[PDB]
Structure 1
Amino acid sequence: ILPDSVDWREKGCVTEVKYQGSCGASWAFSAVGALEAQLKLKTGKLVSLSAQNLVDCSTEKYGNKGCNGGFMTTAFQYIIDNKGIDSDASYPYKAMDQKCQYDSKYRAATCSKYTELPYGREDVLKEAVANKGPVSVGVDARHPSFFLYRSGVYYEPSCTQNVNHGVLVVGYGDLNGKEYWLVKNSWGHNFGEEGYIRMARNKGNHCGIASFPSYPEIL
């Protein structure tokens, strides 16, 4: 039996909203966000992890292009292969492509594995969000209605299932019966509902929210 609503922010499992600025590193913020939650679950401590570490180091071998986009899955694989990721404090976000500056001295997390969820399965996503934690997802964000969103449950008829922007599902619920996914963005505190957007849930994989979900785990 799954809870009707979840909000991982209420459990201390979500860090402050970040601002990617003019560097297309949403994939990096989505990956660290998911891992931050697992680190909290495991160690009891909440610390922002370095999105910049991913931008600079999870590069061509991982199919990523830093400020020109990437995948959360291969970000996790990088952390796995690298045997860690630095704290955001030690390796702060500069919103540009840099030389890899990873230093094991300032490692704040590791990752053992990651799991991908099946395409379009909102039922499976719900279950992972309830039972595992926040889940990294892609959405189709190429719609003025998306970046102009201020409040409520976002539904956009022109939205497609083909994803182009990485975000973090940190919960789910309903607003007077309109089901939603509670989504953490990386466009700062001024986007939407204090950095968050509530996006239509159980409406046919709206904006591809459930197209390519993944989440990491720490042994």
Structure 2
Amino acid sequence: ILPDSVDWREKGCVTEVKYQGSCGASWAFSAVGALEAQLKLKTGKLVSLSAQNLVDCSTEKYGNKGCNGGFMTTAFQYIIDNKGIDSDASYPYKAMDQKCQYDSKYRAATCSKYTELPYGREDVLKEAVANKGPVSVGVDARHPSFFLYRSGVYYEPSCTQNVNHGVLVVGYGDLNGKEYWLVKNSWGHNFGEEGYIRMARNKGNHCGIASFPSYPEILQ
């Protein structure tokens, strides 16, 4: 028994679409995105968290290379190890690699744990999005059709399950029988449907959307 559609934006758990620019920081926006929702759930406060904090501070120890890419899971581990992440207000995004300037005075969130979901399992991802909240995922975005996407249910026959771009699954549903994942990107408001893309669901792990899902939690 799961709901047929969910959209975590309607629950006030999704901050504004961000704009990564020419820095490969999608992993960091995916990670803060997922944690922003858990922060809202636990505290009632909706606050954008610092993607730049992760870019600058969750580096070699975490297998991450700032503007040259990273992992959402090891970004979560950084936040756990660091005992904090700064607000985006305090530590705003510059689309470049900088020296780590974390200050605990401006800590806006904490992270207690994270969970990695099994590869390709869109049924388990559906359960997680319904029962836990927005889920950080990777997709195969190396396709002109992705960059040019305007509206509708995205399907790309040449998509692979090898991911290269981090995004956030904030919901799911179906548009007249065509099932989709509701995805928040970090390419600004002029990408897709006001910064969002609806990507084909239950179509064989399309564009690797369920290849590497993960989500953080903030425990009492």
User: Normalising by the residue count of structure 1, what TM-score does the alignment of the two structures yield?
Assistant: 1.00
Give aligned pairs, total: 219
* Alignment match, 2:212: 212
| 1:26-71 deviation per Cα after TM superposition (whole angstroms, max 9, x unaligned) | 0000000000000000000000000000000000000000000000
Q: Give the Cα separation in 1 of the matches to 2:114 and 2:103.
A: 23
How many angstroms does 1:210 deviate by?
0.1
RMSD: 0.3
- Secondary structure (helix, strand or coil) at the match of 1:159 reads coil
Task: State percent identity of aligned pairs.
Answer: 100
- Secondary structure (helix, strand or coil) at the match of 2:45 reads coil
- Secondary structure (helix, strand or coil) at the match of 2:174 reads strand
Q: Give the Cα separation in 2 of the matches to 1:70 and 1:159.
A: 21
Q: Give the Cα separation in 2 of the matches to 1:152 and 1:141.
A: 16
| 1:59-103 deviation per Cα after TM superposition (whole angstroms, max 9, x unaligned) | 000000000000000000000000000000000000000000000
How many angstroms does 1:4 deviate by?
0.3
Q: Give the Cα separation in 2 of the matches to 1:135 and 1:44.
A: 19
**Structure 1 unmatched runs, 5+:** none
Q: Give the Cα separation in 2 of the matches to 1:94 and 1:155.
A: 32
| 1:129-183 deviation per Cα after TM superposition (whole angstroms, max 9, x unaligned) | 0000000000000000001000000000000000000000000000110000000
- Secondary structure (helix, strand or coil) at the match of 2:167 reads strand
* Alignment match, 1:20: 20
Q: Give the Cα separation in 2 of the matches to 1:158 and 1:190.
A: 24
How many angstroms does 1:186 deviate by?
0.2
Q: Give the Cα separation in 2 of the matches to 1:106 and 1:129.
A: 29
* Alignment match, 1:51: 51
How many angstroms does 1:108 deviate by?
0.1
The ranges of structure 1 where at least 4 consecutive aligned residues each deviate by more than 3 angstroms after the TM superposition are none
Q: Give the Cα separation in 2 of the matches to 1:21 and 1:89.
A: 18
User: Normalising by the residue count of structure 2, what TM-score does the alignment of the two structures yield?
Assistant: 0.99
